[PDB]
Every structure is written in C-alpha cells, then in structure tokens.
Write a protein that binds this ligand. Structure first.
Ligand SMILES: CC(=O)N[C@@H]1[C@@H](O)[C@H](O)[C@@H](CO)O[C@H]1O
Ligand SMILES: *[C@@H]1O[C@H](CO)[C@@H](O)[C@H](O)[C@H]1NC(C)=O
Ligand SMILES: *[C@@H]1O[C@H](CO)[C@@H](O)[C@H](O)[C@H]1NC(C)=O
Ligand SMILES: *[C@@H]1O[C@H](CO)[C@@H](O)[C@H](O)[C@H]1NC(C)=O
Ligand SMILES: *[C@@H]1O[C@H](CO)[C@@H](O)[C@H](O)[C@H]1NC(C)=O
Ligand SMILES: *[C@@H]1O[C@H](CO)[C@@H](O)[C@H](O)[C@H]1NC(C)=O
Ligand SMILES: *[C@@H]1O[C@H](CO)[C@@H](O)[C@H](O)[C@H]1NC(C)=O
Ligand SMILES: [Cl-]
Ligand SMILES: [Zn+2]
Lengths: 596, 194
C-alpha cells in the first residue's frame, strides 16, 4: 500500500529484466571484440537498441515514484539512478540534434587526417602521431604535425563544441542542475548519510587543497624537465620561462612517459627488464595468467572459475580474424567474466594483466549485489583497484620471490632511482593537465567566461599553472584542447584523478596492514591474507553505501588526502631537492618562443 | 526386487522449474541408494532428518521427490527456515522436514547457446507461503492499490524468466535440484531397502 514496497517490486523487475538484456548486449559486445564480421555488427545494433529501449521504458515507468516517500537508502539510490533521464528530458528535436553532433565528433576525430606540405603522406592520429612523437626527437616535425592537426580539427569542431555547451547547459538546467558541471559532479553526491554527506563544491575545495599541498612538487619537477631539455636543446627553451607545449612527450602533454630517454639521470645502470628471462623459460599467456592467479591467491582472493579459461580469448587468434585488443573486460555477470588483451611476451603485458585482474576481482566482488549497484562505489575505484595490483607486482621483491629475477641479486641504487623516475613521470605528468582540463570544462559549463577569450585565458593559466606555453599564438578561432579522446566523446576526467589518489591511499593502507618496513615503494602485498580480507571488506561493497564509508573501510578517512602522494616519493624528492640547489624553481608566464 | 524409477526421475529432459514443483510419488519401491551416490559429482547433499549413510536400514511408507531448476544461490537457499525470493514465493520447505536434498549441475544439458527461457519463477505474491504448496498462479500481480488488468503501471506479472546460457560461471549455471521427502509415521511401510 506504501510507495516503498511498490518501488521494491519495480526494482526487482528492473534487476531481472535488465540482467537478461545486459547479458545479451555485453555477450554480443564480446562477439565484436573478437569476431568483427559485418553481420554481428547488425546483431547487437539491434541488441543495443533493445537494451536502450528497455532502459528508457523502465525509467519512464519509474518516474511516477516520488523520492520524498522512500526511506531505505539502498532503495533511495536505486530509484535515484533510475530517475536520471539524461537526454530524454529535452525535446525530441534537441535530443536528435545532440546525438547527431555526437556522431559528427566521433566521425571527425576517428577520421581526422593531416596532409604534409607534400600531400603524398596521408597520416592519422593513430598510430602516426604516436610514432612521430614517441620515436622522433626533431623539433620541426613535431611542431608542424601537431600544429596542423590542431588547426584542422578545431576548424571543424569549434562551433560544434559551442552548441554542445549551449545544449548541455539547457539539459542540466532541465534536470535541476545549475550547470552540466553539476551534472558531472552528481556522481559523488551522497545524501541521507550522517557523517557521510557531501555536496558538489566540497570536492572542489578538496581539489584546491590538493593543489595547495602539491604545487611545489610539480613546480620542482617541471624545473628538472626544463633543465634537462635545455641541456639537450639549449637554443629552443628558456631556463626560467615555461616549457613549450609541443615538448611534453606525448600528443597533448598528458603523459611524460617518453621523456625517459632524455631525462634518465644515470643512463648506464640497467633497468628492470625480465622479458629476456621470459624467453629464457618460454612463458606464455596461460602461464602469465596463472602467475597472476598465484599472486591473487596469496592475497586470499578467490580463483578464476573454469568459464574464464574456457571461453575468454587469451592470445591473438591468428590472422584470419581481426581483433581490436585494447586491454578490456566488461561485466557480463553471473560469474561469467572474461578478458581479451593481446598477450605478447613482455612486462607491459604483465602489468596490464595484473591491472585487468584487479578489474576482474573487483567486478566479481560485488556479484551478489543488485544490478544498479554492480559498479564501483564511484567511477574512480575500478581503475585504481586494478592499478594497485600492477604497482605491487612491479617491485623487484616479487620478481625475486617468484623466481622471475635471479635470486643472487641485490636492490641496486641508481637502478631503483630510475625505477622511481619510471613510475613518477608516468603519473605526475598526468595530474596538472587532467586537473586543468576538468577545471576548464567546469568554468565552460558555469559560463563565467564568455565566448571570445576561451583560448586566451586557457593558455595564460596554462602558462601560470602547468608551465606550458603555446609555440604558436592562437586566437578565439581555436578549440585546441577538444582534440583529446575523452573530451571528444563526453567522459569525465576526475576519474583519472580519483584513480591516482585513491590507488595510493589503498596502497598505503594495505602496506600498513602488510606490516612492511623500509622504503614504501618496495612494499609488496604477498602472503598477507589479513590485508586481503581488509581489501575484500570494501571490494564486496559496491555502490550500496556511500563511497566514503568504503574508503574508510580501508584507510579510515572519510576524505581523500595527499599524504600517500607525499610519502611515496619522499626519498625521490630528497634527491631532487638536493639537485635543484643550482637551478631556478618556478616559471615566468610572459615568455613565449615567438616573442623575440 | 522391483527397482524404483530413480533413474527415470533423475534422467528426464525437462525437469519442471520451482514454479511447478513437479512432485513424483514413491511407493512399492525398493530404495537402491548407490545410484543416489554414484550419479553425478553433485554439488549439494545436505541431509537433515535422516543420516546420509545410515538410511538404507530404514523402511518408509511414501517418499516425495520434487524436481526443479534453480541458480547457484537458491541451491544453498533451499533449507528449513530460510528467506529470499525462492524460499518464500516459489518453494518453501517445512521446518520439521526430514530427508535429503539433491543438487547437481546441468549446463551442457540445460543451458543452451542463445539461451533458455522456459524455466519460469515467481517473485511477488500477496502473502507468505505454506510448506509444500503449488501455486501456479498466473495472475498478473498488483499493488499500488490500483489493481489493474495488469502488466503495466505497477502491474506486474507473477512469473519471470531464467535466462540460461552455456557460459554462465557457476554462480548461476542452471543447477538441477530434487528434494527427497520422508515421513516416520506409523503405517504399513511399503518402501524397504535390501
Ligand atoms: C506438475 C507435477 O507435479 N507433475 C509433473 C507432470 O506434470 C510432468 O509431466 C512430469 C514430467 O515433467 O513431472 C511430474
Ligand atoms: C566469428 O566470426 C564469424 C565471421 O565469419 C561469425 O559468423 C561468427 O558468428 C563469429 N563467432 C563468434 C563466437 O563471434
Ligand atoms: C532495505 O533494503 C535491504 C536490501 O534489500 C533490506 O535488507 C532491508 O530489510 C530493507 N529495509 C527496510 C526497512 O525495508
Ligand atoms: C637466458 O637467455 C638465454 C636463453 O634464452 C641464455 O643465454 C641463458 O640461458 C640465459 N642467460 C642469458 C644471460 O642470456
Ligand atoms: C609466499 O609464500 C610462498 C610459500 O612458499 C613463497 O614461495 C613465496 O615466495 C612467498 N612470497 C613472498 C614472501 O612474497
Ligand atoms: C648507492 O648504492 C651503491 C651500491 O652500489 C653505493 O655504492 C652508493 O654509495 C650508494 N649511494 C649513492 C649516492 O650512490
Ligand atoms: C540417460 O539415459 C540414457 C539412455 O536412455 C543414457 O545413455 C544416459 O547415460 C542417461 N543419463 C545419465 C546421466 O547417465
Ligand atoms: Cl596542450
Ligand atoms: Zn582498463
């Protein structure tokens, strides 16, 4: 007679029918991932159409349930997830305009080709630009290429982005959000939980506090970046001014991983390389995944069920059938989980295998929970839980223990220095850029900046925060940062930040439970089943109760903190603070490479 | 020495789901129990009122075998004094039940690529069940105080579908569960063991 029971019954249904439809859709998605033939394309175009139709119909039916007469928090959040109408809140004309422009970005970004002044060489974003950047060191090629790609991709996608902003602001205002920024902020919203409630701007204040606690680290590491690059290239980089944009190691400054070859401190020490020992013992995909299983058994997590080994593709299926194998694993459910990732005999594959196994363990952990809660407590848990396993497996103590590194070996000083540099430049390089794209999308949807100085303000505070300067001045007729993948296809970016900070929080908590002594980057979670149970205490939780309670279940702190970031790189930062005694710290915003 | 159709109850091809408790009656049989041991590796063999090995020395009046299909969790759910969507709306086992439960997996046999969609179960009835009750109650279920023709606004259909496929991992691979019900009541005992 009361609305609570009616909502519970509707949830029962949504659970069962959504399970059936989603299993169908995701199984056919796997059929894509392996067999990309034209017919199966159709098959789950109809399957995804069916899944979307069921989702829309169920949401429309659920809209009759009021949230003011419901008390059970699980039911609260299930209903709230149901009631996010999204694009359906707008008119049909606006919805079709939105989705057709979405398709237009998809096509343009997937097909953006740049002709060199000799038009012979037709080149794309992938793998052409990736090769050009991460392989060549020439200034002129990098500048010409990236400037041309920007200058043509923007010219097509600028007014499209403007109308995206307009229509997304309209949609957010329709859904009782002040701005589309609040729409992306709504994921961390938790209400009705005493000592655990969190607003939309509280995370903004948290991130600003993280700036206040992190700045000197990134200013300082930027100082070495410019110093080493001017040692390599003296006439192109000022010693006090900011680093120019087209010298950050990758396509858009996101990762500084390719700066290794130019920024290795001691190039004569050998880096940790076990691949040779892979062909020494002739390791294979079955063996590497079995090693991952031995690892995850040593942390008391449950095994891989027979369906895993039986049905998932584990090595490339010859040349007759083409497979796109970006390391991925989605939730079929009912125990039926599976992975495709092309296994080569390397360490990057080992790290990605451990990452995907973290994914799988997390995904099975909440298998018993209902459908609307079978996800990470926030969007940033899954990838962080995946990556902590990779970081744990990356230490040489594990390699010695499993026999993949020669036991007659001792931790070498300048080699582990390079090792810390490896995991440093692959992480901290992403932080300011991800922060900063996210802040600009916040202010874009907020409307604090008008249409006519987007790029100007972008690049000026790019100079003052990240220390990045345009090597070509660009006017308001540009939309350069739109050229990235995720911005081009409407995903958030705090997922990367939450991943990055949460993974170090979890690693700190686990190594504290692991009773590991000494250097913290040498910590391993192995034969530590108490730590495994500690982790599982959060792993089983999913989305049922607020993510901060789950975070406390590992660390005991209701908010994200920078202390693992500071502590992880401490001896590293001592070495560097003793190294900057003869170099400038900080950057000047006035200098640009074409201001002579 | 007339053997009892344990083979023909354990080797069928369409064991009716929980929603048709498919109960077979046992009388004038000899209860060979080596077939109850060698048949299939099994997954659940919890006995409550009868010892699982000191049972051949007993003679019973009647035995009732019910024959369903459930998922992994419901197999452990079937027990005296339990709660959930299968222990309260489709099949309820009395607290004073004395017997054994049998549950062994069947996928190759009952799942099917593309899938099964015949085993149908129930989710919402007006009230609670009584032990050993069949209720095929094809009655568009209602609530919301606007009883309706049904299948619509808060109008639900009692049954549901078991999406069964040959790749589901253990936890919901279609298990085949049959429950053996005895009674130790004074009567002409007809089912004796050798
Ligand atoms: C429903 C019931 O209790 N009786 C069933 C009968 O209808 C069915 O034909 C047979 C095999 O399915 O099992 C018994
Ligand atoms: C494999 O690809 C072929 C295309 O020749 C397709 O017919 C078949 O359905 C695919 N199988 C699976 C399991 O996806
Ligand atoms: C709230 O939902 C949970 C999960 O279904 C259930 O265990 C609990 O009894 C519910 N609480 C109330 C008051 O109905
Ligand atoms: C491993 O490499 C090869 C065998 O693949 C051989 O030289 C020897 O067994 C091992 N050691 C070294 C140094 O190569
Ligand atoms: C965990 O214990 C096993 C048991 O022998 C051992 O082989 C392995 O090296 C241990 N791992 C460690 C100590 O990291
Ligand atoms: C680093 O370790 C090496 C061990 O080979 C040692 O000789 C050296 O003194 C240590 N410290 C420095 C600053 O190299
Ligand atoms: C069912 O009967 C057939 C013959 O009718 C037999 O071959 C099969 O083995 C039996 N099933 C089992 C599980 O033994
Ligand atoms: Cl940039
Ligand atoms: Zn991934």
């Amino acid at each position: 007679s009361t609305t609570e029971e009616q909502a519970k019954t509707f949830l029962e249904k949504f659970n069962h029918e959504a399970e059936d439809l989603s299993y169908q859709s995701s199984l056919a998605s796997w059929n894509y991932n392996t067999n990309i033939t034209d017919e199966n394309v159709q098959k789950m175009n109809e399957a995804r159409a069916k899944w979307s139709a069921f989702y829309e119909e169920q949401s429309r039916m659920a809209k009759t349930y009021s949230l003011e007469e419901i008390q059970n928090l699980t039911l609260k959040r299930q209903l709230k997830a149901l009631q996010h109408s999204g694009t359906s809140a707008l008119s049909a004309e606006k919805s079709k305009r939105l989705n057709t422009i979405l398709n237009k970005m998809s096509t343009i970004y997937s097909t953006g080709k740049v002709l060199d002044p000799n038009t012979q060489e037709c080149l794309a974003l992938e793998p052409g630009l990736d090769d050009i950047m991460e392989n060549s060191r020439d200034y002129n090629r990098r500048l010409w290429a990236w400037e041309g790609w920007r200058a043509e991709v923007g010219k097509q996608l600028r007014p499209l982005y403007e109308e995206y902003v307009v229509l997304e602001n309209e949609m957010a205002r329709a859904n009782n959000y002040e701005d589309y920024g609040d729409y992306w902020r709504g994921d961390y919203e938790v209400t009705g939980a005493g000592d655990y409630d969190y607003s939309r701007d509280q995370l903004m204040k948290d991130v600003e506090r993280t700036f206040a606690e992190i700045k000197p680290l990134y200013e300082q590491l930027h100082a070495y970046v410019r110093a080493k690059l001017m040692h390599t290239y003296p006439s192109y980089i000022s010693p006090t001014g900011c680093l120019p944009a087209h010298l950050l190691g990758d396509m858009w400054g996101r990762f500084w991983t390719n700066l290794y070859s130019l920024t290795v401190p001691f190039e004569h020490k050998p880096s940790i390389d076990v691949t040779e020992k892979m062909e020494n013992q002739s390791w294979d995909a079955e063996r590497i995944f079995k090693e991952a299983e031995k690892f995850f058994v040593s942390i008391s997590l449950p095994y891989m069920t027979q369906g895993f080994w039986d049905n998932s593709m584990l090595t490339e299926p010859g040349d007759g059938r083409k497979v796109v194998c970006h390391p991925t694993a989605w939730d079929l459910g009912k125990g039926d989980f599976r992975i495709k990732m092309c296994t080569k005999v390397t360490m990057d594959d080992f790290l990605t295998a451990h990452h995907e196994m973290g994914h799988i363990q997390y995904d099975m952990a909440y298998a018993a929970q209902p459908y609307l809660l079978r996800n990470g407590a926030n969007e940033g848990f899954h990838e962080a839980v995946g990556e902590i396993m990779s970081l744990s497996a990356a230490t040489p103590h594990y390699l010695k223990a499993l026999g993949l590194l020669a036991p007659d070996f001792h931790e070498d000083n300048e080699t582990e220095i390079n090792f810390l540099l490896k995991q440093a430049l692959t992480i901290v390089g992403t932080l300011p850029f991800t922060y900063m794209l996210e802040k600009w999308r916040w202010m874009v949807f907020k409307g604090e900046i008008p249409k006519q100085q987007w790029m100007e303000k972008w690049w000026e505070m790019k100079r003052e925060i990240v220390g990045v300067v345009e090597p070509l001045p660009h006017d308001e007729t540009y939309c350069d940062p739109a050229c990235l993948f995720h911005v081009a296809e409407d995903y958030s970016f705090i997922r990367y930040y939450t991943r990055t900070i949460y993974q170090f929080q979890f690693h700190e908590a686990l190594c504290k439970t692991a009773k590991h002594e000494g250097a913290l980057f040498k910590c391993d979670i192995s034969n530590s089943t108490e730590a495994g149970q500690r982790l599982l205490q959060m792993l089983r939780l999913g989305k049922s109760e607020p993510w901060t309670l789950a975070l406390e279940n590992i660390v005991g702190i209701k908010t994200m903190d920078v202390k693992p970031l500071l502590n992880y790189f401490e001896p590293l930062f001592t070495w560097l603070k003793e190294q900057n005694r003869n170099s400038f710290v900080g950057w000047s915003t006035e200098w640009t490479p074409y201001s002579d | 020495t007339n053997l009892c159709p344990f083979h023909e109850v354990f080797n069928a091809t369409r064991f009716a789901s929980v929603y048709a408790w498919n109960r077979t009656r046992i009388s004038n049989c000899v209860a060979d129990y080596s077939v109850l041991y060698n048949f299939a590796p099994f997954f659940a063999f919890k006995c409550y009122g009868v010892s699982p090995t000191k049972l051949n020395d007993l003679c019973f009046t009647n035995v009732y075998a019910d024959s369903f299909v459930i998922k992994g969790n419901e197999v452990s759910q079937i027990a005296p004094g339990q709660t959930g969507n299968i222990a309260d709306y489709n099949y309820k086992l009395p607290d004073d039940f004395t017997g054994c439960v049998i549950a062994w997996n069947s996928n190759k046999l009952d799942s099917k690529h593309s899938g099964n969609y015949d085993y149908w179960y129930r989710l919402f009835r007006k009230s609670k069940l009584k032990p050993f009750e069949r209720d095929i109650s094809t009655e568009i279920y209602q609530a919301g105080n606007k009883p309706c023709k049904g299948k619509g606004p808060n109008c639900y259909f009692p049954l549901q579908s078991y999406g069964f496929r040959p790749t589901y991992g253990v936890g919901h691979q279609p298990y085949r569960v049959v429950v053996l019900s005895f009674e130790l009541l004074h009567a002409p005992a007809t089912v004796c063991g050798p």
